[PDB]
């Protein structure tokens, strides 16, 4: 057990931006925080840090309180809107950050090319880009041995050839027993890696847990889209009555959603008649779980 929040709410004077957050964590998990902007995800990891006082409770971070530097060593932090000292060599900033983390200069070299900035290293970071800031912003969290990891929108402005590269690096990190904390706003991609989702409400929490039992309580349809399969008439009248929404288009395709237990039994009959050309089907995803859980309460 690493991070344990105990019923804590958080205010900004009268602006109580957190409502009664009780949230725990084991020691190998991968967490996904979601929700709207302003829901408190940047406020959440600050409360995991010592940056904010737990107003109506306390946190238990590695069995401890977050104001201790022996507890504040093995975490790994990356914020949103990350910025640095704009006048230095970015390796030298990381060489400056290595002295604060205690890791030697044998780590700063490979981490610069793990995020792949060695082609344009040793320049000013104000002469970098938004990806090149965030790739440098990734690397300071990679210093030493981060047992805890904290990721406040890490994938912003990143190449998708390298966005899932950190996901495999995330997948390389929970195998060696390092629990991460990940919030994101791109909802695809992360679902291969998230062990437990923690989508939360406005000030409150909505739901917790892993992916599949979160799909239980959500009424979830599968989604089928087509364009000119064989017919328009029979596809409408087969699903206006048989427990589905036959959304009645006209280009010889009726885009009917099935209820995801109903695609097992009749899509063998369906696309045998609707002779298929290029048709994709959409499982009710975590993104589809999100908008339900957004609309589950207000």
């Amino acid at each position: 057990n690493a991070v344990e929040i105990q019923g804590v709410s958080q205010r900004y004077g009268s602006m109580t931006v957190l409502h009664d957050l009780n949230l725990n964590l084991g020691e190998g998990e991968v967490l996904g925080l979601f929700g709207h902007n302003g829901a408190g995800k940047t406020t959440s990891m600050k409360l995991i840090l010592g940056l904010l006082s737990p107003s109506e409770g306390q946190v238990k971070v590695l069995g401890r309180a977050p104001n201790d530097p022996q507890v504040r060593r093995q975490l790994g932090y990356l914020p949103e809107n990350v910025t640095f000292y704009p006048q230095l060599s970015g390796r030298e900033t990381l060489r400056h950050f290595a002295r604060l983390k205690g890791a030697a200069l044998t780590q700063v070299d490979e981490l610069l090319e793990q995020v792949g900035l060695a082609h344009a290293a040793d320049r000013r970071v104000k002469t970098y880009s938004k990806g090149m800031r965030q790739r440098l912003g990734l690397a300071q969290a990679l210093l030493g041995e981060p047992r805890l990891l904290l990721l406040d929108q890490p994938t912003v402005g990143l190449d998708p050839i390298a966005t899932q590269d950190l996901y495999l690096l995330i997948d390389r990190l929970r195998q060696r027993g390092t629990s991460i904390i990940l919030c994101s706003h791109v909802l695809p991609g992360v679902e291969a890696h998230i062990n437990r989702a923690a989508i939360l409400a406005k000030g409150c929490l909505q739901a917790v847990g892993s992916l599949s039992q979160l799909r239980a309580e959500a009424g979830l349809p599968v989604r089928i889209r087509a364009s000119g399969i064989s017919e328009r008439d029979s596809w409408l009248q087969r699903w206006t009555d048989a427990g589905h929404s036959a959304r009645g288009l006209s280009e010889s395709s009726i885009e009917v959603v099935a209820v995801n237990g109903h695609k097992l039994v009749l899509l063998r009959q369906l696309l045998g008649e609707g002779e298929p050309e290029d048709i994709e089907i959409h499982q009710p995803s975590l993104e589809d779980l999100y908008r339900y859980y957004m609309e589950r309460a207000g």
Partner: protein, 259 residues
């Protein structure tokens, strides 16, 4: 210690700032200028060995050597906070005082390197031109000047920390920072005369040996007259100026722990 590392950051920050080492070039031309002043008659540095040029140099240092300290640490917290990157340091395994004093002695070694390359290069300029054989005195009476020169700079640099941690905007930490430069240079010495000119009978002359302690400026103007020639001896006058150092920083450290 990790407190040296942000000071090891800041030595680059006074050199990669090429024009922050070059405040010693400001600090040299006051030294080579008014030594060769001779404003009444000559202008050729006659009594350079005599500390009347040093007491004149100790005079106008009270203008700007507090002010040089005020132009560095006034934004070392709040402009860093408006820069926003200090929270990453707060995630990094640091005490807040360990953040603070390494930010202090980082800037505290900027000007301490700047005096002996600014004034101490001009000591060599006097040692090669005036032909005054003053090896014993200028090793010492400059040292009783120049170690006070960094230390008057050291308290005002700490006096910038007591409000750069307080306020949440940069130009407010330059507006309100001028009030202590208004106080200790211009008006707090002035109201002591206005205290004295009102009470001709009161304000007993044994009180005022402890009223010179309340100004950090005039005690810098008190150890100027060591070699030039007191109710208070010099050794307790050395410690009371650095008594301002400790009571500034923990006042800042309680303020810095409330952001």
């Amino acid at each position: 210690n990790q407190v040296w590392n942000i000071a090891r950051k800041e030595l680059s920050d006074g050199l990669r700032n090429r024009w922050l080492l070059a405040i010693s070039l400001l600090f040299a031309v006051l030294a080579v200028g008014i030594a060769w002043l001779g404003a009444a008659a000559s202008g050729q540095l006659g009594f350079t060995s005599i500390p009347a040029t040093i007491a004149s140099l100790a005079s106008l240092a009270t203008f700007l050597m507090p002010l040089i300290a005020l132009l560095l640490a006034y934004d070392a917290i709040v402009g860093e906070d408006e820069g926003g990157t200090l929270m990453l340091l707060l995630t990094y395994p640091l005490g807040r005082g360990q953040i603070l004093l390494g930010k202090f002695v980082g800037h505290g070694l900027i000007l301490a390197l700047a005096v002996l390359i600014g004034f101490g290069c001009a000591a060599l300029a006097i040692a090669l031109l005036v032909e005054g054989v003053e090896l014993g005195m200028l090793f010492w009476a400059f040292g009783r000047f120049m170690i006070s020169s960094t230390l008057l700079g050291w308290v005002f640099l700490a006096f910038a920390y007591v409000l750069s941690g307080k306020v949440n905007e940069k130009s407010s930490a330059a507006g309100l920072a001028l009030g202590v430069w208004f106080l200790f240079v211009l008006v707090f010495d002035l109201v002591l005369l206005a205290l004295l000119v009102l009470s001709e009978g009161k304000f007993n002359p044994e009180l005022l040996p402890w009223l010179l302690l309340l100004n950090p400026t005039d005690i810098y103007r008190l150890i100027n007259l060591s070699g030039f020639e007191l109710p208070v001896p010099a050794a307790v006058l050395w410690l009371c100026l650095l008594a301002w150092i400790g009571v500034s920083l923990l006042l800042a450290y309680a303020i810095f722990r409330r952001r």
